Amino acid sequence: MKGDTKVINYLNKLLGNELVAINQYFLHARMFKNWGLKRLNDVEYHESIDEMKHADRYIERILFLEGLPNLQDLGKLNIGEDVEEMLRSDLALELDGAKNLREAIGYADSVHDYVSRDMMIEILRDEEGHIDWLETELDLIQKMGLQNYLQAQIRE
Amino acid sequence: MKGDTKVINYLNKLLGNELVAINQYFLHARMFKNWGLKRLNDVEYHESIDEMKHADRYIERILFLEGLPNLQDLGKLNIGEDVEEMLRSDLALELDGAKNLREAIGYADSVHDYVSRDMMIEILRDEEGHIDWLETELDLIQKMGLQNYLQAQIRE
Amino acid sequence: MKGDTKVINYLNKLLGNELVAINQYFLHARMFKNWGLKRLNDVEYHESIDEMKHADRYIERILFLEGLPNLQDLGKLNIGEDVEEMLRSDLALELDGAKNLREAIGYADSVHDYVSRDMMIEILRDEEGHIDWLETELDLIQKMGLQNYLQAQIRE
Amino acid sequence: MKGDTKVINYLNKLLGNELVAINQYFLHARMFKNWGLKRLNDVEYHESIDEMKHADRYIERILFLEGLPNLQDLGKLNIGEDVEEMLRSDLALELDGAKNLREAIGYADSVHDYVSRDMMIEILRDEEGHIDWLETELDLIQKMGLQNYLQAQIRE
Amino acid sequence: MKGDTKVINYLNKLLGNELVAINQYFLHARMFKNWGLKRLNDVEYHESIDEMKHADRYIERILFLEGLPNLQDLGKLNIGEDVEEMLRSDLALELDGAKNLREAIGYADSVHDYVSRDMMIEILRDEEGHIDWLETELDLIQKMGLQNYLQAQIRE
Amino acid sequence: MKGDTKVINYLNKLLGNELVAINQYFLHARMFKNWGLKRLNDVEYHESIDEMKHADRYIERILFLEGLPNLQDLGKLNIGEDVEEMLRSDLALELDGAKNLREAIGYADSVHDYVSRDMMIEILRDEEGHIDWLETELDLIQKMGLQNYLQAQIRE
Amino acid sequence: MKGDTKVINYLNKLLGNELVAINQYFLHARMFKNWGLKRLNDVEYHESIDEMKHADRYIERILFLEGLPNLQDLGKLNIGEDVEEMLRSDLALELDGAKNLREAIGYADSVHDYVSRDMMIEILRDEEGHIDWLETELDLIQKMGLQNYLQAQIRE
């Protein structure tokens, strides 16, 4: 089915977002794992998989709409060197992708691509979930302090 | 069976207490849950259910005694903004309801409504239980300090 | 995540609707139960739980959007004294809440809060279900007459 | 253990009440059964057993308190000739026994026989239950009319 | 295998009958379902499936006899607005299709298409069954009156 | 619940689309089955059922919105005489129904019938799926040629 | 443990290779899936996962050797527009990565990083496997011709 060109661009753009998220989350996961923060590796790893499912959904959609998925361009990774810095980076990224999702969803609706819209809304719901988690951890770090927070990540 | 009017008023009054408790506990639960204090959400949620069972018991009793359960009037909620403040509020409330229960129980006995009395005593036993729990948490917060207490609520 | 203020007000308003529904349905349930209309107690009770799940959804959402859930204000309960009157009251209430849901959903979409919107649409679908049921019972009462309808509620 | 004499008299008196209830309920049960009102035979039969458990409790208590259980004197049975009349009789009887229970309970407390009291309160709770049931059936008969009520008792 | 042309026309004609029956029965089913007459929705729905199996049988037969099944032409639906009217319509339709089946069966035999005949006879046996059911319900409505009949359809 | 009239017309129109799809797909299925293309009969048959579930959804919705489902009018079937021609016909039909779904969805949203909208979106997602399948088969026929394609349908 | 700097560069370089392979294989997989070549989607998808396991191994190794895994730089994807072209591209890529692996393995041995070496050898064994598969498919396409090859990918 020939899709709307601008919807495809959006889908590619969003795809692009998930592909930076996928890498940044996986690196973070294995950084935490290395440091022995087993619990943070577990969650961020599972978030990496999450972003991958998203990427796949865009890819299959672009192909269905007869567009060319762009996995060539990779946006800026921002890794960070300590837990806070790195959580905070993941959150800024999820925040930028939500902004992009909000725009794309609106546009899909206005060109009547309701199923792309529908898939985008479910994705944003997942993103909003990741946002929740990042915010919560970042706040726990302040309430209980960094040392206690770190100890709390040692077991899975 | 026509019940004693004043017993019905008491039962309504007590019902009224449980219905503020139900809401305050549920809000607290989901506040804790949002903050990531999984353990406190678990307990306060289960206390919300507890107060609901109580409310139901009064409702069925008032109806049996041929009175009109009043679910219209809702007493003052006091929510609080941090764990201590909020635990402390739940405790003041349980304390006021116990006082009311003590009064009502005495009166039921003196008009010979022994089964209302019996149901009230079992309820107060549950309340006293909630009082125990609130007091214990509040004391743990002092003994181990707030940061360690918070870390201790992260897992269920 | 800071939500849109007016979306939060809507969410609180809707929350407020569910909290009257929760009480009115529960009272009705136990009123029917008392009268021995076992079947009506079963359904309205299960509708009470239904409205509670809704309330919870709003609460967790308002908290996520960083607003303050208001469980303090309770709208007007209208109880009624016989089956019809009471069914008819539940229906007027579901009807007012659907109207509010329709208004809120539109607004969520226009400020791009697509996930609040999404949760609201699923809720309205449930409400519309309750509307169906109330309408159906009210019509059965006319087609088969009140006496036969009452007999039909004696067993679960 | 030598019990208080007046407590024993009360226990005997109450025993006496259960033994009329036992017979009246059983006769009613088998009257309903004969008429084909299977459902009413089921409940009243189970109430007969209920009263028997009560009788047993008094008997074992009187014997423990070193009194002589009197199963010789049997109060006035009032049978009735149709469903209503007969339900209405069972209800007047439960009502008289509740009155007696209330008096006895008060007295047990004042001579410090707290366990007799305790057993009496549990019994009265059961009685109050039977009262509920009789009242409910009697009201169903008015709401739905006698013919529909009778049809509703044909299956168990 | 080249079939007899007139047999194919008959098969198409009969097919045509089943395709009105299929729709009329399904609409009726969901009309009853909507009204809360759960029991009538269950049966008419299962009759819709029944007619579909019939249609399929004709279709596969026409194709085997090398004819073109006509699913394009749809006879007159007669829906009705109340239970009786609608049952009575389903019955007139089954009656017309039985008449057509009787004619077709005779003709198949006389051109030696014994297997088409055989399949038609089994179908007519099913139809005759549906006729039985419709007649019986229509008579129950008179014997027990409409109100009692309606109550009797509330549970499945 | 009284629905918006134009929404009902749309729902009827869409219903009408599914009812041509149901027949065309079933005929195609049994045409393939007859030709021994077991694999195509399996899929198109399962698509026929799919369209039937859709029809049912519209029917129950129209009835809920207090409209009259029209199963009387049947649009133009286009059958075709060979695999390609017939696949190509099914695709043109799915394409016209998607167009209609897109218009109806927009309109539902603008009159606030969000649940009709919601059901329509899920349907369109299924349709879009059928579109995918038809397009894919049509392209396989070109890539691998007709003879190889036919052989590939012989087993299920 | 501080690793040898040049070993880390190699590990990063190789990592870089797996991350182009991961994307190219996944796109290919879903391209085949879209075209209905179910069998090729299955294998290339499983090769994508394979390359991901590899990437993970490098990442955990670089982190253990105290280096910074570079997931930022992404080499040139070469996608292709038909099966052959695309298989042929995957093969050229596996061939370049094997060359790099051979170089790195030698160097690891000469600086005594025998475990990095060991992990690299196991990886190359997997790569050599993928090479085998690509070569085999490419040859089957010539022996049996493109049409027959395509038909052979339709089922999993």
Ligand code: HEM
């Ligand atoms: C380039 C950095 C990546 C790394 C290090 C990585 C790592 C992993 C790992 C370790 C797994 C678990 C293997 C398993 O399923 O058992 C996995 C699963 C998966 N990956 Fe990736 N991945 C990456 C990128 C991608 C990309 C770009 C895609 C394509 C959208 C993708 C798609 C998938 C899918 C669909 C699964 C299966 C999920 C499941 O069912 O568990 N990955 N990945």
Ligand code: HEM
């Ligand atoms: C208005 C604020 C309330 C909220 C947010 C709330 C929430 C909940 C939730 C989430 C559940 C679990 C659902 C389940 O049973 O699986 C529940 C259960 C229940 N609620 Fe409420 N509730 C509220 C008020 C009430 C009231 C006023 C009553 C009536 C006395 C009530 C009676 C019950 C009962 C009987 C259960 C079943 C307990 C069980 O067996 O688990 N609730 N409530």
Ligand code: HEM
């Ligand atoms: C007129 C041509 C039709 C034919 C030849 C046909 C054929 C069939 C067949 C063979 C089945 C399988 C029976 C089973 O469920 O075991 C079926 C199922 C079904 N049909 Fe039809 N059908 C037709 C039209 C319709 C229509 C107009 C509706 C109403 C919307 C409908 C609704 C259904 C439903 C709800 C099922 C059950 C699906 C399931 O759970 O498997 N059909 N049909």
Ligand SMILES: [Zn+2]
């Ligand atoms: Zn994502």
Ligand SMILES: [Zn+2]
């Ligand atoms: Zn995310």
Ligand SMILES: [Zn+2]
């Ligand atoms: Zn309580």
Ligand SMILES: [Zn+2]
């Ligand atoms: Zn309490």
Ligand SMILES: [Zn+2]
């Ligand atoms: Zn609700």
Ligand SMILES: [Zn+2]
């Ligand atoms: Zn509702």
Ligand SMILES: [Zn+2]
């Ligand atoms: Zn007794």
Ligand SMILES: [Zn+2]
């Ligand atoms: Zn009794």
Ligand SMILES: [Zn+2]
């Ligand atoms: Zn038939």
Ligand SMILES: [Zn+2]
């Ligand atoms: Zn029939």
Ligand SMILES: [Zn+2]
């Ligand atoms: Zn459809």
Ligand SMILES: [Zn+2]
């Ligand atoms: Zn379709």
Ligand SMILES: [Zn+2]
């Ligand atoms: Zn590799």
